[PDB]
Paper text:
Crystal structures of the apo- and cisplatin-bound Prp8 inteins revealed that two degenerate cisplatin molecules bind at the intein active site. Our results further showed that cisplatin inhibited Prp8 intein splicing in vitro in a dose-dependent manner by direct binding to the Prp8 intein. Mutation of the splicing-site residues led to loss of cisplatin binding, as well as impairment of intein splicing. To explore the potential of the Prp8 intein as a therapeutic target, we developed a split luciferase-based Prp8 intein splicing assay. This revealed that cisplatin, an FDA-approved chemotherapy drug, is a potent inhibitor of Prp8 intein splicing. Furthermore, we used biochemistry, mass spectrometry, and solved a crystal structure to demonstrate that cisplatin targets the Prp8 intein as the mechanism for inhibition of fungal growth. In this report, we demonstrated that cisplatin, an FDA-approved cancer drug, significantly arrested growth of Prp8 intein-containing fungi C. neoformans and C. gattii, but only poorly inhibited growth of intein-free Candida species. These results suggest that cisplatin arrests fungal growth through specific inhibition of the Prp8 intein. Finally, we found that overexpression of the Prp8 intein in cryptococcal species conferred cisplatin resistance. Because the processed Prp8 carries out essential and non-redundant cellular functions, a Prp8 intein inhibitor is a mechanistically novel antifungal agent.
Numbering used by the authors: 1 to 72, 90 to 118, 132 to 170
Amino acid sequence: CLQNGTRLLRADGSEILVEDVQEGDQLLGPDGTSRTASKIVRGEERLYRIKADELEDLVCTHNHILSLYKERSYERVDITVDDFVRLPQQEQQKYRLFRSTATLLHIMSIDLEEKPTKWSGFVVDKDSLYLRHDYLVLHN
Ligand SMILES: [Pt+2]
Ligand SMILES: [Pt+2]
Ligand SMILES: [Pt+2]
């Protein structure tokens, strides 16, 4: 569940708005093969803005699942946005976002937006992973 305006990659490589995704649309997975989106859902609520270095901010819902990497080389961990918000900063600094090109990115801030915002979401087959326009790996 991402904020409207988020740009995702189709199976061919071109971009598509998250609000423009429809049932059966072909997204791009982190391994290069295609993904099928289905069960489109929309809403409007106060979202969480995750600011990381280099890459554009990620605005998502409270129940959004983040595919992160944790130190101790690195281990792959899926964690929801709410639990990650509740973790202390000393623990938050151990988690990293990642993009497919295997670049690791520091998560350095995450705050709740002031005003509500429209959001769109869906489910993804296979490993349930898809790519953002900047190749950031995202989970259902
Ligand atoms: Pt979601
Ligand atoms: Pt909710
Ligand atoms: Pt997962």
